[PDB]
Amino acid sequence: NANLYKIWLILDPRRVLVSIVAFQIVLGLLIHMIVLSTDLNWLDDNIPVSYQA
Amino acid sequence: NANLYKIWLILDPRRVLVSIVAFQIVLGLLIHMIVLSTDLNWLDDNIPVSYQA
Amino acid sequence: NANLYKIWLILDPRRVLVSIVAFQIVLGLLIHMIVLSTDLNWLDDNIPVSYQA
Amino acid sequence: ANLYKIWLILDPRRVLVSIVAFQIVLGLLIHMIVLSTDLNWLDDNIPVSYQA
Amino acid sequence: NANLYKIWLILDPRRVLVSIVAFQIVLGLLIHMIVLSTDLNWLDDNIPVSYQA
Amino acid sequence: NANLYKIWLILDPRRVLVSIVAFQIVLGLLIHMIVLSTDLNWLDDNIPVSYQA
Amino acid sequence: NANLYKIWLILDPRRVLVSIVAFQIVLGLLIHMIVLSTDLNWLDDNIPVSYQA
Amino acid sequence: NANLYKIWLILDPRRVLVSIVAFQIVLGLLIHMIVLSTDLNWLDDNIPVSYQA
Amino acid sequence: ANLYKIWLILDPRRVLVSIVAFQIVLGLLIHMIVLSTDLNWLDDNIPVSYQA
Amino acid sequence: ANLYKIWLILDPRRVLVSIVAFQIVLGLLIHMIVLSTDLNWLDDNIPVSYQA
Amino acid sequence: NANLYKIWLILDPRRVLVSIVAFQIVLGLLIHMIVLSTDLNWLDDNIPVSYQA
Amino acid sequence: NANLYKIWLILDPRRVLVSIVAFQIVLGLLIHMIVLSTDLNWLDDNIPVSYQA
Amino acid sequence: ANLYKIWLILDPRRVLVSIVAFQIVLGLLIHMIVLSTDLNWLDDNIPVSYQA
Amino acid sequence: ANLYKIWLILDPRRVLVSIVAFQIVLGLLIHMIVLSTDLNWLDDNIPVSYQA
Amino acid sequence: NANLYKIWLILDPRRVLVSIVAFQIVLGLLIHMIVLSTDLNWLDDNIPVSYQA
Amino acid sequence: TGLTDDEAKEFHAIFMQSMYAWFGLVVIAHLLAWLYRPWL
Amino acid sequence: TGLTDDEAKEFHAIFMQSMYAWFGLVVIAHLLAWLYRPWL
Amino acid sequence: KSLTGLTDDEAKEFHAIFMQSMYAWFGLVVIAHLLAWLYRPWL
Amino acid sequence: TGLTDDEAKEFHAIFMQSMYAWFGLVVIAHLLAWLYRPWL
Amino acid sequence: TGLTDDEAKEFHAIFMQSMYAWFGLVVIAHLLAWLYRPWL
Amino acid sequence: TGLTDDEAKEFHAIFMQSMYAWFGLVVIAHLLAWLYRPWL
Amino acid sequence: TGLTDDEAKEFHAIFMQSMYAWFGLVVIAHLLAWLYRPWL
Amino acid sequence: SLTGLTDDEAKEFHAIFMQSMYAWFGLVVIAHLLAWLYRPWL
Amino acid sequence: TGLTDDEAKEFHAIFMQSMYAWFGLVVIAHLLAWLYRPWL
Amino acid sequence: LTDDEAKEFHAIFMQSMYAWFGLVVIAHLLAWLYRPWL
Amino acid sequence: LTGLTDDEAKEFHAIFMQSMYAWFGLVVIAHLLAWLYRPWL
Amino acid sequence: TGLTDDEAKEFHAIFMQSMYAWFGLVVIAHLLAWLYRPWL
Amino acid sequence: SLTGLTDDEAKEFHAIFMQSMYAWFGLVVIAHLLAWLYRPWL
Amino acid sequence: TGLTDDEAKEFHAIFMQSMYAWFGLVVIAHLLAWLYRPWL
Amino acid sequence: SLTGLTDDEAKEFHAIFMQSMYAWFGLVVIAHLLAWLYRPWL
Ligand code: BCL
Ligand code: BCL
Ligand code: BCL
Ligand code: BCL
Ligand code: BCL
Ligand code: BCL
Ligand code: BCL
Ligand code: BCL
Ligand code: BCL
Ligand SMILES: COC(C)(C)C/C=C/C(C)=C/C=C/C(C)=C/C=C/C(C)=C/C=C/C=C(C)/C=C/C=C(C)/C=C/C=C(C)/C=C/CC(C)(C)OC
Ligand SMILES: [Ca+2]
Ligand SMILES: [Ca+2]
């Protein structure tokens, strides 16, 4: 719509920004840990070479 | 019904919006976790290829 | 009866609506879990095909 | 003939709320109880087993 | 005695009715459990027929 | 004695009645359980016939 | 002695009566259990006949 | 001595009597238990005759 | 001589209630310590054994 | 000489209630430390064993 | 936009700076610990020479 | 020094005396236990003669 | 050029105390971490072993 | 030359109490530590074993 | 810098001195224990001679 | 309780009638249960 | 409760009607359940 | 006046009704125990 | 509740309409589920 | 306790009478128990 | 809530439009998921 | 206590007499117990 | 209003919020394209 | 303690008397206990 | 704070953030030159 | 400090010393008897 | 913080100088450690 | 003063304290000499 | 802290002198330890 | 001052503190010399 900006007359900008930042950081950490536990792991997969051997 | 908008004369819009956002985020996380535990898993299914082998 | 609407002169509409929404959501989650745990499971039943094999 | 005077002693709101809550809890409890016995209708492989 | 009704000038009718209702409900539940735990069980006795076989 | 009714000028009738009813109910439940736990059980004794056949 | 009744000018009659009643009830229960746990048991002794078997 | 009665100018007679009664009751129970735990038992001694067997 | 002045320092009642309570707790200790020894008089089968 | 002035610093009553309680707790300890040794006099079967 | 500086009229510079410093320190510690546990460990890898042997 | 007594103008004599007495008693008990736990034990060493044998 | 104005926002005393505490804790942690690896300089029997 | 001014900064009584307590605790700790090693002087059968 | 003494117009000398003393004592104890736990121990090294023999 | 004599009489009458009806229902249910599954 | 006589009468009438309707629904459901899966 | 606030006549009436009710309860208990003895003797 | 009679009437009408729509959606979903995976 | 002399006398008389009756009942019960199941 | 009639109308319109857009996005995502990994 | 001298005299007399009666009952019971089960 | 903001402030905040959100989404899309080029998962 | 000189004197006198009596009882009990079961 | 203070703070903040990012980039380039992970 | 005059302190010290000496004498007698019965050193 | 401009300038100068000295000591220590025990 | 004592009181307390401490140390020394005569430990 | 300029200067001088003395003692102790038990 | 002491009191306390500390250190040194004579540890 054209009046969507009026949402800022209902929601406080500061709280919205703080919540967005915190949620994005926590989500990034969570997704990185979740992908680390699958077979898509990029650290402990001995590519290009294994450095402990 | 024609007079459905009067639902906003009983329920506070800010609380409704905050509840909707929180519930939708929690539901999305829950459904993704539920689908990951079944045989519909897309991360740890060795498709297209297995990267740890 | 014809005077059933007078039930709204006894019970608060807002609390009734909030209770209805919460109860319906919790009941939906509970019934979905219950049907998931039985023989009627639709996710982990290898239909149409098994994607992990 | 004067049974309606029971509403001059008991508050209608509390009666209605208690009735609704008790009926819901009783329904859940009885459904569980019948579900744990030999009368189970979900895990009985009727009309046909779907996991096999 | 003929004056037994004066028992209502000592005990509060509302509390008596509430206590009676609660006690009767709890007693009904307890007795149904107790009869269920014996060999008088009517649910899990395979009569008239066994439906899980 | 002839003046035994004077016991009601020191003891409160309502408290006496409530104590009597509560004590009698608890005693009845306890004695029924004790009789059940002994050889005098009437539910788990297969009389007249055993129904879990 | 002839002036023993003066014991009621020192001890409160109501507290004495309540204590006597409670102590007698508790003592009766205790002695019944104590005799019930010995070989003087009258319930679980198969006299005059065993009813379970 | 001849002035022993003045002991009642320190100790409250009510407290002394209550303490005496409580101590005597507790001591009686304890001594009955202690004599029961030895080989002076009169309940589990099969005298005059064993009733369970 | 002047030992009676010890009661102008110490309170009688707290003292008469302290002598009684100590001598009853010592009575029950010195009696349970002589029952855990070879001097027990109850479980010693003298004069005769009554549960045999 | 002038040692009696130690009572213008310390309180007689607290000193007298502290000597009594310490010497009763010391007495009970030194009697249980000599009962756990080869000097026990109760379970030593001297003058004769009574449970036998 | 060209008015991005106006964000400082919404947020508080001191709290932002403190949060940035703390988050950066914690993130650095966490990432160093995570990399230490993988195949990319640089301390306990016997390169260029093992010093305990 | 010749003005050592001035230590009593900064330190309270009563607290010093109480602390000295308590510390000396506790130290005496501790040292007696420590010497008892070694092979310098004088009670349980069968000297001059064993009394339990 | 105007970086010194950071001291018109942050309190110098708190900054100094935080810096000192953080540096001390970091030093202890890094010394432990290097001790736990094979870069240990205490239990490496160099130059000689003193317990043998 | 002006070290005594430290007593215009620190309270003498607290310093003295802390010194006494720390010295006593350190003495006990060091005595226990030396006891736990092979420099023990009590349980070393010198000059003669008394339990044998 | 030449004005380094101005550091005493910011930090309280008493707290600084107390913190220095406490930290140095704790560090000394910690380092002595750490050296004791290694093979640099000077107590349990049987040098010059072993006294428990 | 704050009740008068007439209120006590009315409450006693209605209480007795309701209790008798409840006891009658209980008796009928127990007769049916005995007809189905005797226990003594 | 603060209710008058007329309010009590109206509430009793509507309560009775609603409870009878609920009991009718329960009876129909139990008849269907007995037709499908008899238990006695 | 009195600790419980009752008068003499009130106490007399309460005592009479209490005794009547207690006797009725004891009679019911006696009948039940007679039936139980007739069914399942225990002594 | 502080509601007048007209407000109660309007709320009852809208509540009934919405409840009927919700029940219709539930019925359609259950018909689809029975068509896919019968359970009785 | 707030009791007068006459109140104490009356309470003592009734207390003694009731205690004697209770002891008599206890004695009768113990005689019956001894007749049934002797223990000494 | 303190809202007037016009504010309620405007909020309802914008809420409905946003909800429809969100439902459309959800439908598109579920169609894409069905094209990749059918589950029924 | 707040007791006068005469009250102390009377209480002492009654207390002593009651204690002697209690000790007499105890002695009789212990003679019976020695007659049944000698323990020493 | 509830937040104390006027109409013009709301309009300006909405414009800048939309711009920043679009930039963040563009960065996320670029990163995901790079990850798919490196390690395909579907 | 609030005691005068005469009260303290009489206290001490009867305190000593009763303590001596208790000592006599204890000594008699210990003498007969030694006569029965010597422990040293 | 006023508008000019916000502008000055934004300028200095952006400059410092760019310097920090440059340092991070250099460190990651060195790490890749030493121990590649991809 | 403790509210005692000089004479009260003198008297308390005298009786305290006398009682302590009597208690120590009783202790010494008991320990002599114990040594006569059961020597420990 | 209650600091004037000149105080901020002086504090910044001294802080920078001290930080540079600390970093110099750190790099000297790390050079010695690398000379003794290389880790990369 | 901190403790509320005058100079003369401090002097008297110090004298008596030192005398008592010396007596206690003498008793300790005698006891340790007896213990060494009985059970040498070094 | 309430200190003036002169007090700060004097405290700094004495603090520096004491710190240097402590560091010298530590250096001597470490030299002795290295002479006895080398660790590197 | 922060401790309520004058300059002369500070001088006197410092002198007595130094003397007592030196005496304590001398006693410790003598004890350690005796211990080294009995049981050398290095
Ligand atoms: C196979 C998996 C790939 C990988 C696949 C992806 C994918 C796909 C994504 C990331 C994204 C990220 N990855 Mg990666 N990533 C990998 C491994 C790593 C490793 C590591 C040590 O292994 C680290 C430290 C990172 C770190 C990062 C972050 C830069 C970023 C997380 C966004 C966030 O949480 O901010 C959220 C914080 C806020 C929103 C706060 C608001 C903004 C603040 C003030 C500034 C944020 C800085 C911003 C994240 C930097 C963007 C520049 C990028 C370098 C392009 N990845 C491996 C190599 N990674 C995400 C991303 O690029 O976001 C742009 C992303 O979509
Ligand atoms: C064999 C089992 C079938 C299945 C059989 C059924 C049956 C039968 C039913 C559902 C119903 C639902 N199913 Mg299903 N369902 C299956 C698998 C799923 C999966 C999954 C990941 O596998 C999910 C996420 C869902 C989710 C859902 C919800 C959309 C819905 C419950 C809503 C609710 O609780 O309202 C509570 C919330 C409120 C009351 C709030 C008020 C309404 C708000 C404003 C909007 C709610 C969304 C509404 C449901 C929209 C319906 C439109 C479409 C018909 C979906 N089902 C499988 C395929 N499912 C129920 C339903 O459709 O209800 C209409 C229902 O009767
Ligand atoms: C073998 C066992 C049978 C079975 C035998 C029965 C029997 C017998 C009964 C039910 C009843 C019910 N069953 Mg069933 N039921 C089965 C399996 C299910 C399953 C499932 C996933 O398997 C579900 C979710 C249900 C759910 C239900 C509810 C609709 C209802 C519970 C009443 C209640 O608690 O409201 C209590 C709530 C209140 C009193 C609140 C007041 C009213 C509110 C506002 C509205 C309530 C809606 C009402 C329940 C709908 C009635 C229409 C019915 C579909 C007929 N049944 C199987 C197939 N079921 C009961 C019933 O039909 O009641 C009418 C009932 O007697
Ligand atoms: C082998 C053992 C015997 C046996 C031997 C005895 C002996 C011996 C005695 C009892 C006594 C009692 N027994 Mg029996 N009893 C047996 C088994 C039972 C069983 C059972 C289920 O098996 C029950 C329920 C009882 C119950 C009882 C009580 C009636 C009574 C406990 C007194 C009390 O506590 O009140 C104390 C409460 C108060 C003092 C409160 C004040 C008064 C209150 C208001 C009213 C009290 C009612 C009174 C108990 C009525 C008793 C009169 C009749 C003689 C029954 N017995 C078996 C058969 N029993 C005692 C007794 O009869 O007392 C008269 C008693 O001496
Ligand atoms: C081998 C062991 C003997 C035995 C040896 C003894 C000896 C020896 C004694 C008792 C005494 C008692 N025994 Mg017996 N006793 C035996 C088995 C029992 C059994 C049982 C079920 O087996 C019971 C219930 C009892 C119970 C009793 C009590 C009557 C009494 C406890 C005194 C008390 O505590 O009051 C203390 C309470 C108070 C002081 C409160 C003040 C007074 C109150 C108001 C009234 C008290 C009632 C009084 C006890 C009545 C006693 C009169 C008759 C002698 C019974 N004995 C067996 C057979 N028993 C004691 C006794 O007889 O005392 C007179 C006692 O000396
Ligand atoms: C092998 C060990 C010997 C033995 C060797 C010793 C030796 C040695 C001593 C005792 C002492 C005591 N022994 Mg012994 N004792 C033995 C066995 C016992 C047994 C037992 C059941 O076996 C008991 C009950 C006792 C009892 C006692 C106490 C009377 C006394 C502890 C004093 C105390 O703590 O008061 C603490 C209370 C106070 C300090 C209060 C302050 C002063 C008050 C006014 C006086 C208290 C009363 C006084 C102790 C009574 C003395 C009379 C005695 C019977 C001589 N002995 C065995 C046989 N016993 C000690 C003693 O006799 O003290 C006099 C003592 O030195
Ligand atoms: C194989 C892995 C490599 C390695 C790969 C990397 C990579 C890649 C990076 C680091 C980075 C860092 N590494 Mg490294 N690092 C290794 C092993 C180590 C070891 C060790 C004992 O083994 C230590 C102590 C460190 C320590 C460090 C820090 C200096 C730095 C993280 C700082 C921080 O959290 O800022 C958070 C603190 C703040 C934001 C506060 C604000 C700034 C304050 C005022 C000053 C901070 C000091 C600053 C970091 C100085 C850096 C300049 C030089 C490049 C050192 N690394 C090994 C050799 N390391 C990061 C870095 O260099 O950042 C510049 C980085 O990107
Ligand atoms: C193989 C490992 C090497 C080793 C490699 C390193 C490396 C690399 C470094 C150190 C550093 C340090 N090492 Mg080293 N170190 C080793 C073994 C030890 C042992 C031991 C018992 O074995 C000890 C006690 C130490 C202790 C020390 C500290 C002197 C210092 C820690 C700095 C700090 O935390 O201050 C932080 C406190 C503050 C910032 C507070 C502010 C200033 C305060 C008031 C004064 C600080 C005094 C300062 C540390 C003195 C520095 C002078 C140096 C001796 C040249 N190392 C072995 C031999 N060590 C670090 C260092 O030298 O820093 C200069 C360092 O970079
Ligand atoms: C192989 C080990 C040696 C041994 C080696 C050493 C060495 C080395 C030292 C001691 C010291 C001490 N040893 Mg040693 N010690 C041994 C075994 C013992 C045994 C025992 C039961 O075996 C005991 C009780 C002691 C006890 C003592 C203390 C007297 C003293 C520590 C006091 C203190 O902490 O002051 C802390 C208290 C304060 C600071 C308070 C202030 C002073 C107060 C007012 C008075 C304190 C009394 C003072 C210590 C008297 C010392 C004079 C004589 C030298 C005894 N040692 C064995 C034989 N011991 C230390 C010492 O002699 O200190 C002088 C010391 O350096
Ligand atoms: C003020 O009044 C005005 C004037 C307005 C008039 C209005 C008056 C009105 C409207 C009055 C209405 C009154 C009503 C409706 C009264 C209803 C009364 C009812 C239904 C009473 C029912 C009573 C039932 C009782 C008391 C049953 C008791 C049973 C007992 C205690 C059984 C116990 C059994 C036991 C303990 C068994 C135990 C053994 C086992 C093994 C089962 O234990 C588990
Ligand atoms: Ca015996
Ligand atoms: Ca012996």
Short mmCIF file of N, CA and C and ligand atoms in Angstrom, two decimals, chain D residues 2-9, chain E residues 13 17 20 23-24 27 30-31 34, chain F residues 24-26 28-30 32-33 36 42-43, chain P residues 3 6-8 10-20 22-23, ligand 10:
data_model
loop_
_atom_site.label_atom_id
_atom_site.label_comp_id
_atom_site.label_asym_id
_atom_site.label_seq_id
_atom_site.Cartn_x
_atom_site.Cartn_y
_atom_site.Cartn_z
N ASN D 2 -38.86 -23.90 42.30
CA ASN D 2 -38.02 -22.74 42.60
C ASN D 2 -36.54 -23.04 42.38
N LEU D 3 -36.21 -24.04 41.56
CA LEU D 3 -34.82 -24.40 41.35
C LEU D 3 -34.02 -23.24 40.76
N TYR D 4 -34.68 -22.33 40.03
CA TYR D 4 -33.99 -21.18 39.47
C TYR D 4 -33.34 -20.32 40.54
N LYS D 5 -33.83 -20.37 41.78
CA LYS D 5 -33.20 -19.59 42.84
C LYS D 5 -31.78 -20.03 43.13
N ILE D 6 -31.33 -21.15 42.55
CA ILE D 6 -29.92 -21.53 42.67
C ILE D 6 -29.02 -20.47 42.05
N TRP D 7 -29.56 -19.62 41.18
CA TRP D 7 -28.79 -18.54 40.58
C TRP D 7 -28.74 -17.30 41.46
N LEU D 8 -29.44 -17.30 42.59
CA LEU D 8 -29.29 -16.26 43.60
C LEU D 8 -28.24 -16.61 44.64
N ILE D 9 -27.55 -17.74 44.48
CA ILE D 9 -26.49 -18.18 45.38
C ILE D 9 -25.16 -18.32 44.64
N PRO E 13 -24.63 -22.24 52.76
CA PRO E 13 -25.08 -23.10 51.65
C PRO E 13 -24.12 -23.15 50.47
N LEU E 17 -22.48 -26.58 48.92
CA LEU E 17 -22.74 -27.05 47.56
C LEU E 17 -21.45 -27.23 46.77
N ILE E 20 -19.67 -30.32 48.04
CA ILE E 20 -20.36 -31.53 47.61
C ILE E 20 -20.02 -31.85 46.17
N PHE E 23 -16.24 -32.95 45.84
CA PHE E 23 -16.02 -34.26 46.44
C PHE E 23 -16.64 -35.37 45.60
N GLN E 24 -17.85 -35.14 45.09
CA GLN E 24 -18.50 -36.17 44.28
C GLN E 24 -17.74 -36.43 43.00
N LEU E 27 -14.52 -38.34 43.89
CA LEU E 27 -14.85 -39.71 44.27
C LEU E 27 -15.22 -40.55 43.05
N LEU E 30 -12.01 -41.43 41.26
CA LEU E 30 -11.22 -42.39 42.02
C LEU E 30 -11.82 -43.79 41.94
N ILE E 31 -13.14 -43.90 42.07
CA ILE E 31 -13.78 -45.21 42.04
C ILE E 31 -13.69 -45.82 40.65
N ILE E 34 -10.25 -47.24 40.43
CA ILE E 34 -10.07 -48.43 41.26
C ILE E 34 -10.72 -49.64 40.61
N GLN F 24 -14.56 -38.61 59.34
CA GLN F 24 -15.29 -39.81 58.97
C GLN F 24 -15.01 -40.19 57.52
N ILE F 25 -14.94 -39.21 56.62
CA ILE F 25 -14.65 -39.52 55.22
C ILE F 25 -13.25 -40.12 55.08
N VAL F 26 -12.26 -39.51 55.73
CA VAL F 26 -10.90 -40.01 55.63
C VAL F 26 -10.79 -41.41 56.24
N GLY F 28 -13.20 -43.67 56.49
CA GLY F 28 -13.84 -44.62 55.60
C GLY F 28 -12.94 -45.01 54.44
N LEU F 29 -12.31 -44.02 53.80
CA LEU F 29 -11.38 -44.34 52.72
C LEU F 29 -10.24 -45.22 53.21
N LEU F 30 -9.65 -44.88 54.36
CA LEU F 30 -8.51 -45.64 54.86
C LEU F 30 -8.90 -47.08 55.18
N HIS F 32 -11.39 -48.83 53.94
CA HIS F 32 -11.64 -49.57 52.70
C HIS F 32 -10.33 -50.00 52.04
N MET F 33 -9.32 -49.12 52.01
CA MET F 33 -8.03 -49.51 51.44
C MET F 33 -7.39 -50.65 52.23
N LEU F 36 -9.04 -53.82 51.43
CA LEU F 36 -8.66 -54.25 50.09
C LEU F 36 -7.28 -54.91 50.08
N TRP F 42 -12.66 -58.15 47.87
CA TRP F 42 -13.86 -58.61 47.19
C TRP F 42 -13.87 -58.35 45.70
N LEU F 43 -12.95 -57.53 45.19
CA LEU F 43 -12.88 -57.25 43.76
C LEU F 43 -11.99 -58.25 43.03
N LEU P 3 -29.13 -16.22 57.15
CA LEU P 3 -30.38 -16.71 56.60
C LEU P 3 -31.49 -16.63 57.64
N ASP P 6 -37.54 -18.83 57.11
CA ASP P 6 -38.23 -19.24 55.90
C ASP P 6 -37.25 -19.65 54.81
N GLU P 7 -36.15 -18.90 54.67
CA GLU P 7 -35.14 -19.26 53.69
C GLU P 7 -34.52 -20.61 54.02
N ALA P 8 -34.27 -20.87 55.30
CA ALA P 8 -33.75 -22.17 55.71
C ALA P 8 -34.73 -23.29 55.37
N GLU P 10 -37.03 -23.33 52.96
CA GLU P 10 -37.08 -23.52 51.51
C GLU P 10 -35.83 -24.24 51.01
N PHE P 11 -34.66 -23.82 51.50
CA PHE P 11 -33.42 -24.46 51.08
C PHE P 11 -33.39 -25.92 51.50
N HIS P 12 -33.86 -26.23 52.72
CA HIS P 12 -33.88 -27.61 53.17
C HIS P 12 -34.79 -28.46 52.30
N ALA P 13 -35.97 -27.95 51.95
CA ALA P 13 -36.89 -28.71 51.12
C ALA P 13 -36.27 -29.02 49.76
N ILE P 14 -35.71 -28.00 49.10
CA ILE P 14 -35.16 -28.21 47.76
C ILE P 14 -33.93 -29.10 47.82
N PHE P 15 -33.09 -28.93 48.85
CA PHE P 15 -31.92 -29.78 49.02
C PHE P 15 -32.31 -31.24 49.19
N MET P 16 -33.32 -31.51 50.02
CA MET P 16 -33.76 -32.88 50.23
C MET P 16 -34.29 -33.49 48.94
N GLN P 17 -35.10 -32.73 48.20
CA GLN P 17 -35.65 -33.25 46.95
C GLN P 17 -34.55 -33.59 45.95
N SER P 18 -33.59 -32.67 45.78
CA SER P 18 -32.50 -32.91 44.83
C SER P 18 -31.64 -34.10 45.26
N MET P 19 -31.36 -34.22 46.56
CA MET P 19 -30.56 -35.34 47.04
C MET P 19 -31.27 -36.66 46.80
N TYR P 20 -32.59 -36.71 47.02
CA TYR P 20 -33.34 -37.93 46.76
C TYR P 20 -33.30 -38.29 45.28
N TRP P 22 -30.90 -37.55 43.12
CA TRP P 22 -29.56 -38.03 42.84
C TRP P 22 -29.37 -39.46 43.33
N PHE P 23 -29.88 -39.76 44.53
CA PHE P 23 -29.77 -41.12 45.06
C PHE P 23 -30.55 -42.11 44.21
C1 LIG e 10 -31.39 -19.19 50.01
O1 LIG e 10 -32.21 -20.13 49.35
C2 LIG e 10 -33.34 -19.65 48.60
C3 LIG e 10 -34.26 -18.91 49.56
C4 LIG e 10 -32.82 -18.74 47.50
C5 LIG e 10 -34.08 -20.85 47.99
C6 LIG e 10 -33.31 -21.67 47.00
C7 LIG e 10 -32.84 -22.90 47.22
C8 LIG e 10 -32.24 -23.75 46.27
C9 LIG e 10 -32.28 -23.36 44.85
C10 LIG e 10 -31.58 -24.94 46.63
C11 LIG e 10 -30.97 -25.88 45.82
C12 LIG e 10 -30.33 -27.01 46.29
C13 LIG e 10 -29.75 -28.08 45.60
C14 LIG e 10 -29.78 -28.07 44.12
C15 LIG e 10 -29.15 -29.16 46.26
C16 LIG e 10 -28.58 -30.32 45.77
C17 LIG e 10 -28.04 -31.27 46.60
C18 LIG e 10 -27.42 -32.50 46.31
C19 LIG e 10 -27.37 -32.96 44.90
C20 LIG e 10 -26.83 -33.29 47.31
C21 LIG e 10 -26.16 -34.50 47.22
C22 LIG e 10 -25.48 -35.15 48.23
C23 LIG e 10 -24.78 -36.35 48.29
C24 LIG e 10 -23.99 -36.84 49.34
C25 LIG e 10 -23.87 -36.02 50.57
C26 LIG e 10 -23.32 -38.07 49.29
C27 LIG e 10 -22.35 -38.56 50.15
C28 LIG e 10 -21.69 -39.76 50.03
C29 LIG e 10 -20.53 -40.20 50.69
C30 LIG e 10 -19.93 -39.33 51.73
C31 LIG e 10 -19.90 -41.42 50.40
C32 LIG e 10 -18.65 -41.88 50.78
C33 LIG e 10 -18.08 -43.07 50.40
C34 LIG e 10 -16.77 -43.54 50.62
C35 LIG e 10 -15.84 -42.68 51.39
C36 LIG e 10 -16.31 -44.77 50.15
C37 LIG e 10 -15.03 -45.16 50.13
C38 LIG e 10 -14.52 -46.47 49.65
C39 LIG e 10 -13.82 -46.45 48.28
C40 LIG e 10 -13.13 -47.78 48.01
C41 LIG e 10 -14.83 -46.12 47.19
O2 LIG e 10 -12.84 -45.40 48.30
C42 LIG e 10 -12.25 -45.01 47.07
#
